[PDB]
Design a protein around this nucleic acid. Sequence first.
DNA 1: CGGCCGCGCA
DNA 2: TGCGCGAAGCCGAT
Length: 450
Amino acid sequence: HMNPKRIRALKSGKQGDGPVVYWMSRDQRAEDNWALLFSRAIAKEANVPVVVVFCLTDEFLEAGIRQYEFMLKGLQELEVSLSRKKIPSFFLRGDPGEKISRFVKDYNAGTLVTDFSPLRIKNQWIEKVISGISIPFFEVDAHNVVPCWEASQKHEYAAHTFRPKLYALLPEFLEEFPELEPNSVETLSDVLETGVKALLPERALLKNKDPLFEPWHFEPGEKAAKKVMESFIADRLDSYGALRNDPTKNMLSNLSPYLHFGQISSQRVVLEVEKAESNPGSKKAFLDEILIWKEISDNFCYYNPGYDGFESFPSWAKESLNAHRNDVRSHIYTLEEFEAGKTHDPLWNASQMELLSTGKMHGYTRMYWAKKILEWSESPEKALEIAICLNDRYELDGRDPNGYAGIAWSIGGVHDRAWGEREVTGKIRYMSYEGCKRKFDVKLYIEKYS
DNA sequence: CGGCCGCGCA
DNA sequence: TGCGCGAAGCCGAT
Ligand SMILES: Cc1cc2nc3c(=O)[nH]c(=O)nc-3n(C[C@H](O)[C@H](O)[C@H](O)COP(=O)(O)OP(=O)(O)OC[C@H]3O[C@@H](n4cnc5c(N)ncnc54)[C@H](O)[C@@H]3O)c2cc1C
C-alpha cells in the first residue's frame, strides 16, 4: 500500500549504517500516517530500526496555554502508543535547524524522513538541516489525500478549477492504510510545567482574574479524535447539509483541532464518511470541505509564499481595496478593543467570546468576524494583521494553511470573485448583521456567549 | 463564452 | 427556511 508519488527526495547522499529517523512535525499520530509507514518500510528493507524525533521550539510563547497543553497531552499519549510498537521517541528542545542536524550526527542516522507542510518556517528549517547533513532526506505528504505537488503544479484561482483535478485522482490516491509493523531490530511533564509557567503572565483572564479558557469542550489526543469522528458520523452528519451554517446548532464535525495537529488523518475521515449511509447532500457538502477546501489551502500556501500578506490577493482585489484606502470607516477599533469584544456590534462581540472561551469559533461566524475586522480597521494591512493575530493566538486549530486561506478569502477575495461595490471594502463580498438575522437565531447565539 | 452574498417571494 | 435573481470579473477549456 505504498504509492511512490507520496514521497520525494529533498536531498541525495550516501545512505548510512544506522536507524531511519522520522522527524515528525505536522502529523502527531501513530496510526494512518504515511510518513511513519514509509520510514518503517525503508527501515525494513535496510534491516535497521525506525525511531521518531520531535523538536519542541520556543514558538509556543507566541500562542497560549490552550494550544501548548492540547499539543503536549497528545504527545504524552503518542509516546505510549509508539512504545507498544517498540518504536522509541526522542523529544528535543530548541531550533530544529541546529537540533535535527546534531541528532542525525550524534545518533548515526542512515536516512532522514519528514512529513509535509507548506508554511515558510518549515522550509527554512529543511534548508538548514540539508546544509548540515550528508545522508538522504525524504519528504512524505501525510496530511493530504492527494500529495500537494501532484494535485496541481500551480496556484489555483478557484475551487472550480482545483475540484476536477483533485477528484480525477481520488480513484488512485483514496485507499486504506496498512497496519504499522512493530520494530524487530527531561520528561514531557517537566517541559509542560516549565512552559505553562513561562506563559502564565499572559493568560486570558476575566475581570475577576479567573481564566477565560474552558478546556472541557475538546479532549486532546488520537483516541479522543477518533471518538469525535465516530460521533460526527452517528449524530451530526445527517443534518450537516442543512445546518452547517447555523452557529446556534452543534452540527459541525468538531475535528479541526485534531486535524490541525495531525492527531487524526483526513484520509481516514474521508474513508469512513464515504462508507457511511447518510443524507447524500450532507456527505457531498462535508467531503467537499475536507477534500477541496482543505487541500486547496495547502495549494495556496505552497505556491504563494506571501500567503499571509496583501501581496497574495488577486489583482482585482488589490486594485479595489487600494482605491478605497481614503474612505472614512464607520468605526475604527484597535487590536485590544477587538480582542476584548468591545465593539458596537453584539454579534461580532459574541463571536469573539466564543473564540476566547472555547478556542473554536463556528465556521460561519469566522467569515463574518474577519469581514468586520476589514470594515472597522484603519487599513487593509492592519485588518489582515489583526485577524491573523487573534486567529493564531486563540484558535486551537490556528497557525494553519486553512487559517491563512480562510482569512485571505474573507479579507482579500482569494478563491472568490468581485461581488458588489461599497465604501471601504470595495468589491470584497459583504456580509451583514441583518443577513445573519434572516438565516439563524442571532439572539440565541449572542445570549449563549454573553 | 461557461460557470462559479442580500433581497424579494413562496 | 428554501430557491432564484441581481449585478457581475476572470480564468481556462475551445
Ligand atoms: C476567517 C477564517 C479563518 C479560519 N481559520 C481557520 C484555522 O485557523 N484553522 C482551520 O483549520 N480552519 C480555519 N478556517 C476554516 C474553517 O472555518 C474551519 O476549518 C472549521 O470551522 C473547523 O470546524 P470543523 O472541523 O468542525 O468544520 P467542518 O465543517 O466539520 O469541516 C471539516 C473539515 O473541513 C475543512 N474545512 C472546512 N471549512 C474550510 C474552509 N473554509 N477552508 C479550508 N478548510 C475547511 C477543515 O479541515 C475542517 O476541519 C477559517 C475560516 C475563515 C473564514
